[PDB]
């Protein structure tokens, strides 16, 4: 078994699981983390080379699946029940399972406990909170407004979606960008800007710097940002995103997944390694202790990690969010929604005009 996983993951932890596998079965496991892994893989796999197993964010696997580079996996319904049901939707392509879910990642509400010991449960509370904090030379909320990945949780809350997902597939013509729910959510966001509670220019670095210096009470960000907050000594918490019109915010969900090279002659070995060695409490812990996985798809071990409320928050927002579609038409979604939000928030277009142009 040759395994590819990215350098920022717990690859030495993964190699320890590989050593236990070799100890029980005699099969050597070699874990590599080449640069630009996600680019090399489809090049060597078309040859018939590459690793037996590749670890990556689920949305990349749709391209690999379209090219026929990933084997269909065959987990029992008993095994599938060990993982949170929603994660199995992330690893489907044309209705077929093509990868094992490993870990779960999504935006959360990050708040400064010294400024705001009890963070709001609803988006509708934030204007009055901002007026209060402005009087103290602070602000209520700052987060990246430039990229739709960061603004979508609010836009989707009341009914927006990228592509309709049913059975195990995406209807690439059922797009939920300009329905009434997405109009409501973007309208509420634009009103936050018009009422000076947020600034249309705010981006990732501006919001990060303000939160980590204590100038704003809340931000919206993912687990990749926590360790900079740890460095800054802000006393922070991480919690479920605010509701909008009583509906949960729906952040996009990324699922670290393990796929099996279609050209591997070791497919039954890869299945045993993943199902019976990695996707166990002891396997995921070995990986996690090296580099934290965040929230994991395996119910039994996530219940342990969620003793950390930050991780429980990540999983809770992920269960309420929207699996990121693994299809190439997402690229048009990103460009279109990006323009829509910029134009609506700057005033060039009305919310209605901007979302209608994006849907087209």
């Amino acid at each position, epitope marked *: 078994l040759v395994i590819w996983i990215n350098g920022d993951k717990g690859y030495n932890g993964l190699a320890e699981v590989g050593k236990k596998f070799e100890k029980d079965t005699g099969i050597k496991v070699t874990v590599e983390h080449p640069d630009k892994l996600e680019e090399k893989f489809p090049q060597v796999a078309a040859t018939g080379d590459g690793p037996d197993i590749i670890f990556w964010a689920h949305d990349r696997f749709g391209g690999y699946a379209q090219s026929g580079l990933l084997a269909e996996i065959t987990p029992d319904k008993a095994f599938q029940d060990k993982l949170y049901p929603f994660t199995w939707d992330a690893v489907r392509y044309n209705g077929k399972l093509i990868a094992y879910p490993i870990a779960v990642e999504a935006l959360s509400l990050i708040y400064n406990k010294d400024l705001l010991p009890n963070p709001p449960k609803t988006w509708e509370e934030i204007p009055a909170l901002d007026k209060e904090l402005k009087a103290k030379g602070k602000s209520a909320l700052m987060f990246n407004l430039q990229e739709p990945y960061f603004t979508w949780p609010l836009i989707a809350a009341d009914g927006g979606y990228a592509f309709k997902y049913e059975n195990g597939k995406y209807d690439i013509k059922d797009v939920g960008v300009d329905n009434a729910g997405a109009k409501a959510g973007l309208t509420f966001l634009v009103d936050l800007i018009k009422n000076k509670h947020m600034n249309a220019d705010t981006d990732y*670095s501006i919001a990060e710097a303000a939160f980590n210096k204590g100038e704003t009470a809340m931000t919206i960000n993912g687990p*990749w*940002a926590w360790s900079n907050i740890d460095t800054s000594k802000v006393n922070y918490g991480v919690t479920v995103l605010p509701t909008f019109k009583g509906q949960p915010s729906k952040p996009f969900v990324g699922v670290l997944s393990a796929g099996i090279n279609a050209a591997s002659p070791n497919k039954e070995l890869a299945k045993e390694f993943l199902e019976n060695y990695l996707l166990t409490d002891e396997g995921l812990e070995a990986v996690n202790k090296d580099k934290p996985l965040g929230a994991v798809a395996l119910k039994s071990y996530e219940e342990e990690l969620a003793k950390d409320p930050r991780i429980a928050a990540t999983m809770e927002n992920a269960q309420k969010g929207e699996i990121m579609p693994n299809i190439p038409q997402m690229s048009a979604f990103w460009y279109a929604v990006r323009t829509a939000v910029i134009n609506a928030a700057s005033g060039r277009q009305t919310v209605d005009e901007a979302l209608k142009d994006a849907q087209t």
Partner: antibody
Amino acid sequence: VQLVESGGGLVQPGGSLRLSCAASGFNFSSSSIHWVRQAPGKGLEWVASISSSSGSTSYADSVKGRFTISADTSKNTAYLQMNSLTAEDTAVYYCARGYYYTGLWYPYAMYEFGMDYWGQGTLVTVSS
Amino acid sequence: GSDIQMTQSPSSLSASVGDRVTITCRASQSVSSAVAWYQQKPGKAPKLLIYSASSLYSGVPSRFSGSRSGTDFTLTISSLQPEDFATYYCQQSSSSLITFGQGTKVEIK
């Protein structure tokens, strides 16, 4: 936030030199460190970079095979090992922090990239 | 795709206090908007002015601005000030082989 280069000096053609960049005031483990050089009277030339979280390194074609960039996260220090130096390598060498975040969606690009903090530079002279 | 040059123009510019100054940079292939602009004065380290083609770095005066048209990037100083005489460099970070433009020296009488 600050970056302090050291290790520069006068070196014979074909010789070696190791530069350091001691950092402080930011989370080193989540940063990228870049070396940029400037030959006398000429423009900036990017030379190498290292990502602390992923360990990945990159090199300019002009130094590939001769330079090695590394970092000790516990010392908050990055290093540039330079070999087979010639007059083409005479320059002030700057280290800089590359700020960015990585897209969570394909193609996982870098966003908001900028070398926001720079050292004072350390001079490398290859004698003639 | 890793092999990207930045062609900056003009190499040198005579300008007066109050002039509008325009510096252009053409990427040899698409770099999306991963372009930054830097200012450097003699004997000193470069300073970041603009990132993501058009975002003003915190604390930089508002007379500096940047824009993108396909593979063409422009740095504009709306009304030049005496502290603005310097060399300016574009930079792309689309390829992991980061590259700088050749620089534009803005020169006083």
